[PDB]
Amino acid sequence: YSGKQSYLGSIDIDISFRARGKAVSTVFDQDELAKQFVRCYESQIFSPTQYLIMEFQGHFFDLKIRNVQAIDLGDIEPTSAVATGIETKGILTKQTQINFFKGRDGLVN
Amino acid sequence: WYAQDQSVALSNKCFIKCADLKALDGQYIEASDIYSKLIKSSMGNRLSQWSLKDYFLKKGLCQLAATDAVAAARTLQEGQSEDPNFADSRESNFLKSLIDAVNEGDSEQLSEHCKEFDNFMRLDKWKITILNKIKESIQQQEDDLL
Amino acid sequence: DMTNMDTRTRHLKVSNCPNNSYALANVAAVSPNDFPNNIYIIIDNLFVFTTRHSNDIPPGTIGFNGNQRTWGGWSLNQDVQAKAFDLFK
Lengths: 109, 146, 89
Description:
Chain B: This is Alpha-soluble NSF attachment protein. By secondary structure, chain A is mainly β.
C-alpha cells in the first residue's frame, strides 16, 4: 500500500489519565515511556487517532496518536510532511522520535 | 400473543414487565432488546411518547449495566435524533451524564448525577438496582485496576 | 535459620499479586522450587522481602503488590534480579 514510506519517523502521542481520580504528581520520564512503547509493541502498524491503554509502573494511561510521519529507509532527512490523515501508516522502530503532549484533560505532568 | 392479535398496548405492557424483570434478573442485553422492541412499537404514537422518553433511558441504563457504554451512547443519540421530545427531556440529559461518568470512571460523579435526577424526578427500585450494579461494576473495575 | 541457602541470582517477572491476602502479608510469595520458606531475599540489591511458599505462583516468577511497584517504580511483566539476603553480615 505505502510502497516506500514503511517506517515511523516522528510520532506525537497525547497522554491522558484514564481515571480523573488517579491523578499523580509523579514525574514521568518520556524516554522511559518511549522505551516501554518500543519494548511492548514492536513491528506494529499504527494510524493517527488510534487509541491505546498503557500500564506504566501500575498507572493506566490513555494514549492517542495525534499525528504520524511516515518515512522510507535511506532518507537521511525527514523531508516528508507530517500527515494527520488516517491514510498514513507505518512500522514502529527503535529510533522513532516520540513526542508526548498533554491530553485534552491536561492532568498528566 | 398480544402482538399476534395486534394489541399493541397490551403487548407493550407485557414487554415492559418482561424487560423490567429481565433487567432485575441480570439479563441486561435481553432487557435492552425488549426495550428496543417497545421503542419501535411505540414510535409515531402520540399516546405512548413519555413511555418512549423512559424507554430510551431504561434501555441505556441496561446497556450501561452490561458495561457497554458505547451502546448506551448510540441509544442516546438515536433517541435524541428520532424523538424531539426525548432530546430535550431530563431523561436524555441524565443518560448522557451517566454515560460520561462511566466513561471517566467517576463513581462519585455518577452518584451526584443520580441525586440530582432524584431531586426533580424520583427514582424507582428498578433504576436503583441498575445503578447500584453499575456502581459495583465501577468498583470491580477498580479491583481490575489492581 | 539463614546459615545455609542457595544464593544464586534469579531473574523473575513482576506480576499482579495473587490476591488481597498475600498483598496484606507483604511477603514475597514464591514457589517451593524457587527458594526455601521464611527466608529474607533481596531484589536489585535494594528491596528486601520475606519469602513464603505459594503454589499459585509458578517457579521463576515473583509476585508484588502495587505499593512495592510504586517503591521500585516497576511495571507489570518487568524483569528483576533476586538473590538471597543476609542482613546480619
